Amino acid sequence: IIEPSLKALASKYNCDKSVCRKCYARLPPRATNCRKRKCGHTNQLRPKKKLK
Amino acid sequence: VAFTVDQMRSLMDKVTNVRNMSVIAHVDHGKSTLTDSLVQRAGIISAAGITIKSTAISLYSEMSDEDVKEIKQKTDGNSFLINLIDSPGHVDFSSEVTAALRVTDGALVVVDTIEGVCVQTETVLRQALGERIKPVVVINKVDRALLELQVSKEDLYQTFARTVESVNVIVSTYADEVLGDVQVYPARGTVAFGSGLHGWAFTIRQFATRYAKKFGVDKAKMMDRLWGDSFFNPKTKKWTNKDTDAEGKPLERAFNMFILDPIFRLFTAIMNFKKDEIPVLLEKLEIVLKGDEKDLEGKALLKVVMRKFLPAADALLEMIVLHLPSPVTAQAYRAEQLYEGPADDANCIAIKNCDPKADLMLYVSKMVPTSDKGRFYAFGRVFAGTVKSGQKVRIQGPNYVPGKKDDLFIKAIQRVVLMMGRFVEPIDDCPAGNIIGLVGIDQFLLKTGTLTTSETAHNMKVMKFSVSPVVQVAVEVKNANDLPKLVEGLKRLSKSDPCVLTYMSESGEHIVAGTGELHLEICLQDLEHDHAGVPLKISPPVVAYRETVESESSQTALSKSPNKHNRIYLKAEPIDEEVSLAIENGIINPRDDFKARARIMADDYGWDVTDARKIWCFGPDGNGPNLVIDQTKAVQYLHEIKDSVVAAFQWATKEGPIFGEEMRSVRVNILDVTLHADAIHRGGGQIIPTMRRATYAGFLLADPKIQEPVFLVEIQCPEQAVGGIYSVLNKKRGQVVSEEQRPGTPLFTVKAYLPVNESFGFTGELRQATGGQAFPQMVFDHWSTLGSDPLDPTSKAGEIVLAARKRHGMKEEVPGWQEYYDKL
Amino acid sequence: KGIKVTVQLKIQNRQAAASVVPSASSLVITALKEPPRDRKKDKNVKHSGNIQLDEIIEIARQMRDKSFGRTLASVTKEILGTAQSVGCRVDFKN
Amino acid sequence: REKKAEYFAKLREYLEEYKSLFVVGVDNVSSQQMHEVRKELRGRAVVLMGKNTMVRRAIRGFLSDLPDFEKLLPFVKGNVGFVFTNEPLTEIKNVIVSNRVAAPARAGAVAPEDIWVRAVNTGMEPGKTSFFQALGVPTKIARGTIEIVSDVKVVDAGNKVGQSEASLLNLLNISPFTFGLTVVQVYDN
RNA sequence: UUCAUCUAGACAGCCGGACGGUGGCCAUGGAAGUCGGAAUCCGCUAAGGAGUGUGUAACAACUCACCGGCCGAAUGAACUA
Numbered sequence A: 001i002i003e004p005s006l007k008a009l010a011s012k013y014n015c016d017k018s019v020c021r022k023c024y025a026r027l028p029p030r031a032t033n034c035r036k037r038k039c040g041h042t043n044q045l046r047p048k049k050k051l052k
Numbered sequence B: 001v002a003f004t005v006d007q008m009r010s011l012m013d014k015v016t017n018v019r020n021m022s023v024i025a026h027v028d029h030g031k032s033t034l035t036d037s038l039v040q041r042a043g044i045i046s047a048a049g050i051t052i053k054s055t056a057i058s059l060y061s062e063m064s065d066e067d068v069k070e071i072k073q074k075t076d077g078n079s080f081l082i083n084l085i086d087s088p089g090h091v092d093f094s095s096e097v098t099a100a101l102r103v104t105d106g107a108l109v110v111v112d113t114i115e116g117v118c119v120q121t122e123t124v125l126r127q128a129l130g131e132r133i134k135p136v137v138v139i140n141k142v143d144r145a146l147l148e149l150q151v152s153k154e155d156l157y158q159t160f161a162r163t164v165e166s167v168n169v170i171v172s173t174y175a176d177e178v179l180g181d182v183q184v185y186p187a188r189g190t191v192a193f194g195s196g197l198h199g200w201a202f203t204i205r206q207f208a209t210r211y212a213k214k215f216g217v218d219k220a221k222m223m224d225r226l227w228g229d230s231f232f233n234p235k236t237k238k239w240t241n242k243d244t245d246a247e248g249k250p251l252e253r254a255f256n257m258f259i260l261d262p263i264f265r266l267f268t269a270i271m272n273f274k275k276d277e278i279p280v281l282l283e284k285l286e287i288v289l290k291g292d293e294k295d296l297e298g299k300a301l302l303k304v305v306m307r308k309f310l311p312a313a314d315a316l317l318e319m320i321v322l323h324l325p326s327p328v329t330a331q332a333y334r335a336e337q338l339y340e341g342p343a344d345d346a347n348c349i350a351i352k353n354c355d356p357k358a359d360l361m362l363y364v365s366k367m368v369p370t371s372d373k374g375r376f377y378a379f380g381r382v383f384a385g386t387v388k389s390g391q392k393v394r395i396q397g398p399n400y401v402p403g404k405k406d407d408l409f410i411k412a413i414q415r416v417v418l419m420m421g422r423f424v425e426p427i428d429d430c431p432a433g434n435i436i437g438l439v440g441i442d443q444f445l446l447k448t449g450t451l452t453t454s455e456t457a458h459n460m461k462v463m464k465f466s467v468s469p470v471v472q473v474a475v476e477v478k479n480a481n482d483l484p485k486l487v488e489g490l491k492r493l494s495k496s497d498p499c500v501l502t503y504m505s506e507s508g509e510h511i512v513a514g515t516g517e518l519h520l521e522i523c524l525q526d527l528e529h530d531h532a533g534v535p536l537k538i539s540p541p542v543v544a545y546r547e548t549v550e551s552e553s554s555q556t557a558l559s560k561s562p563n564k565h566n567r568i569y570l571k572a573e574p575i576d577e578e579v580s581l582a583i584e585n586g587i588i589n590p591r592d593d594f595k596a597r598a599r600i601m602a603d604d605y606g607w608d609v610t611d612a613r614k615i616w617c618f619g620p621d622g623n624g625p626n627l628v629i630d631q632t633k634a635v636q637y638l639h640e641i642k643d644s645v646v647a648a649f650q651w652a653t654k655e656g657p658i659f660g661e662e663m664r665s666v667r668v669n670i671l672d673v674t675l676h677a678d679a680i681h682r683g684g685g686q687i688i689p690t691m692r693r694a695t696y697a698g699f700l701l702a703d704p705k706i707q708e709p710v711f712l713v714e715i716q717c718p719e720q721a722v723g724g725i726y727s728v729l730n731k732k733r734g735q736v737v738s739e740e741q742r743p744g745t746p747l748f749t750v751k752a753y754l755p756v757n758e759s760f761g762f763t764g765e766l767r768q769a770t771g772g773q774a775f776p777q778m779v780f781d782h783w784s785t786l787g788s789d790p791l792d793p794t795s796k797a798g799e800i801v802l803a804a805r806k807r808h809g810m811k812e813e814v815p816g817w818q819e820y821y822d823k824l
Numbered sequence C: 001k002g003i004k005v006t007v008q009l010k011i012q013n014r015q016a017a018a019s020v021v022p023s024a025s026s027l028v029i030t031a032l033k034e035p036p037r038d039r040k041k042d043k044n045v046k047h048s049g050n051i052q053l054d055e056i057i058e059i060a061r062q063m064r065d066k067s068f069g070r071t072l073a074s075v076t077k078e079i080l081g082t083a084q085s086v087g088c089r090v091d092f093k094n
Numbered sequence D: 001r002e003k004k005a006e007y008f009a010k011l012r013e014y015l016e017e018y019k020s021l022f023v024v025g026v027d028n029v030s031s032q033q034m035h036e037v038r039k040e041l042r043g044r045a046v047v048l049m050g051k052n053t054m055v056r057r058a059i060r061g062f063l064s065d066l067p068d069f070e071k072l073l074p075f076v077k078g079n080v081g082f083v084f085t086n087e088p089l090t091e092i093k094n095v096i097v098s099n100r101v102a103a104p105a106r107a108g109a110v111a112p113e114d115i116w117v118r119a120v121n122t123g124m125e126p127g128k129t130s131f132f133q134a135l136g137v138p139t140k141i142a143r144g145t146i147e148i149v150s151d152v153k154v155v156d157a158g159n160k161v162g163q164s165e166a167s168l169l170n171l172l173n174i175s176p177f178t179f180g181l182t183v184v185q186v187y188d189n
Numbered sequence E: 001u002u003c004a005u006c007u008a009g010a011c012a013g014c015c016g017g018a019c020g021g022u023g024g025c026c027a028u029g030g031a032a033g034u035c036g037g038a039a040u041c042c043g044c045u046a047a048g049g050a051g052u053g054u055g056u057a058a059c060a061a062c063u064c065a066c067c068g069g070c071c072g073a074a075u076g077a078a079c080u081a
């Protein structure tokens, strides 16, 4: 009912992302280092756990 | 309006004007609200939250003689009795569903406008097609559609189109070839619309007959020209089957154009306030305001607007008769499954022909209870025959079969009752095909039961459910003095709920079954406060374990008496599962001749026919898979030891050494006995303390282990949502025995062994993993040894044993062969 | 015949059912091997093979999915060797 | 630098003997069909692919195996390649402009023409019928199989397709990148 | 400080190829490149790993390496402090 084509444009700005394993910030999916300085811009990341 | 008890009797006589249909609705798709918009409207009366239970509510309908001028089925008159049954929402309550179909032919299918057909709607749909029942859809909540979403004209039509589309699909996959056209189309005026909440409903057919006038277009052509490519040209007035014309400009679909157009205009002018369009469109549709209905504004105004345009009953009661079945054509193709036995019998042929005075064939589909001091009623369908207040009936119990006595009480009916949903009314008689009731059968029949008069006539079908009682729980009294009330109260429960089930455990606990947790609690509430009426207790249903070994003892067992005179030498070796199986299947009998038995146990199960013709005893219970094989040829007074021996054996086989629990697949091989001469030092008092301690020591050397039950669940799930289940077996050790099914039906049935300690709440997780799409058939399968040491409070089996002891208040450790050995 | 890796396409029209076989990798080590590697090894894990076989395999690849598109003989020295754990023919394959 | 340098010796060899060749373009290929067209001619016509490998062949026009490269070099652009033959053109040309036919829709790829589809049942049981639901395509039950209700124009000309719409199209057998490896430049002796 | 890519035409980018044996050895309730251990082969070109991830009940399907269209000089991996 959300049309899979828009439920991709939707996830593009919600699920399609990256998370810093230390501050949890929502970075771009392709980002290599966290843009926050609380974790000194770390390279340790993980794709934002895709829902199911 | 009301009808006298005698008009019901006279009206029921014409099975052609007998409408027996129920409800095919999803949990909250608005069935109760809609079905009761019909009572408040055209509901018949006697002469002068959660749906916990239900009955068959009856309504009257005086149709148009020319509407019945197109009804294809044997139909005589316009004096119709509508025996409407209310099937429960929610799943779990699929017991009442299966049973409400056995006492009907057709059924009313309800669907949500925006929630289309969720899993429960197709659950009820697949159940109706497995009962050969023909349905009729109704898309309710069209108000929450053009209000909670303000949906537009063309978009709304398509919304319904898809609703139709998805339903026909499940209908055609599980349909009947013996019925032909079953998937109801809005093109054939067999799927209405409306709002039970707003008090209205309408079919295309209502306007096809109201517009044949202003067009000279017959009603068969009106509704034909309203669904699909069927368009119109409001520029030349030429109904063209193309959305655009020569200018290439888009038109309105006839349905969204003439029929639906009023509706939106009403809402906005009514809700949003537009008094310059309310009285205006009022007369354009020929709607008439009177009194306080005239002054009304807002959402109140709109409700009453439809109560003058398309009042509920109107097209609703219309279709029920118009296309749905009556006993007549209905039983005339159903009779096969409705009678499980001779489909060519004279009693089964009277049902298929539908004879009101033929042999009395009435089946109580549910013992409908009441605040009648613990007494119920005998609610069921009278396939053929007349109920006489005192008539002698053959109470054929489903166990019973024509050439036997097994539960068959041919007694007579005290009083008889007419069903009215919640109203209890005493009638005289009742003709074939109609569903009625009868008090008095209760104290004779158990839950469900077939009734006849002819001894040739076999039993009818006892549901099939597919739902099955999977859940389990222990119910112990919170006061041992009121236990007697529980025993009786538990009995009443079974009778009440169609798929509910009470039964004793191997642990003594009174295990209680149900379908779902929702289900089970509803049952427990009616149990602690009503059925029994004493504070209960619901604990996890404790499993039984058969302590067992996996090899012959690490050394020969040596046990001596307490006075010290005799000692016993031997070694216990685990028997093949299929050999201990033969013991419990009644092939290797404990009452057999040691030769005949030993030849079939040696030639068939590969043993030494010496110790096989010397197989002393079975244990425990005398029929148990634990036997004592004789291998002592030197012992002089063996005869004064065989009896006292089986005594201390029957004690250890019915109470092991790991924590005092039974065993299984333990063939103890007797190799020696240091006997005496006088049975004064060879009596029970010497031989029993030895035989018991002997067995124990030998066991803890024979490599202990523990045996737990293993299930066999067959989950009926649609092939697309099958992913989740595979993973719930993946979480609770689920070896998939197999996976069979049918080429045309997606419903993939799946067999898979499931260990009892991993099925405690399984149903819920299985249900949450794939939605309630999966229906598990849990029927305990076989016994299977685990894979952890009993003396290991860290391994699977070990942890169990430790928890098992503290429960019975036993000795913490796992006492071994050193603590049961008698050395110098 | 063939027990494991048996990709079997079924092609039927109005009643007439057709039995059509793609004679895969597992089907060739059995169409060549006698009963010692054609049966009784279900409870056994068959991982034994060294013996030379020959040109009979250029036509054995004639029944295996013909989607390779070049030389029949040369492609099998590769397929039948490092993919088949029960046969090493002329030890050059690998 | 391994392959480019050793390939220089190979490239030069077939070009050094033969006096007949075809400049053929693609990109909308398929290893399967591509390497399967090499099978139609595994002795009549050899297919060699390239890139800046013929850009060193601008520096190769310099070598002069025969100075007539003044009618070949300047056609270096596109997923184009070698077509080695010493038999007549007209004959191998009927052949070359006939082995190019198959590509369906990479669900989201570049769509081109107006999609006009006829309304009849395709003989496939109701498996992907839930697709048709939230896609807007009136359907019915005609002998168990799914029957199309209109000669509807599902997808428009020139737009980024969706996975759900090209899935039903994949079972309707619509593969529109159909064409691919044909000709560009022709030259003899 | 190394290491070895590059106008002969890199890195990145955008256009589209990403095949076969093969649902490879079994192992399989089920495993087709993507539960698991062993093989990691050459047929052929520009290439396509018995396959880099996503996904499937397994398939489908998406997507990489490889390889090709264009662009045209760096600037890429690894370590040092």
Ligand SMILES: CO[C@H]1[C@@H](O)[C@H](O)[C@H](OC[C@@]23C[C@@H]4[C@H](C)CC[C@H]4[C@@]4(C=O)C[C@@H]2C[C@H](C(C)C)[C@@]34C(=O)O)O[C@@H]1C
Pocket (backbone or CB within 6 Å): B469, B470, B472, B503, B504, B505, B506, B507, B511, B513, B541, B542, B543, B544, B545, B709, B756, B778, B779, B780
């Ligand atoms: C048709 O309804 C069936 C099925 O639900 C299933 O076969 C169920 O199995 C119950 C148990 C049966 C086991 C064997 C017969 C030997 C051990 C018995 C059990 C003891 O722990 C294991 C399962 C679960 C029950 C424990 C919790 C006490 C059993 C019992 O009846 O006591 O029985 C009911 C009556």
Ligand SMILES: Nc1nc2c(ncn2[C@@H]2O[C@H](COP(=O)(O)OP(=O)(O)O)[C@@H](O)[C@H]2O)c(=O)[nH]1
Pocket (backbone or CB within 6 Å): B025, B026, B027, B028, B029, B030, B031, B032, B033, B034, B051, B088, B089, B140, B141, B142, B143, B144, B194, B195, B196, B197, B198
């Ligand atoms: N908008 C709207 N809501 C409805 C309608 N009918 C029922 N409901 C809602 O559904 C609920 C009752 O569902 P019920 O009738 O209990 O579902 P059932 O048990 O399957 O029959 C109420 O709380 C209503 O808000 C309707 O016609 N329109």
Ligand SMILES: [Mg+2]
Pocket (backbone or CB within 6 Å): B032, B050, B051, B089
């Ligand atoms: Mg209700």
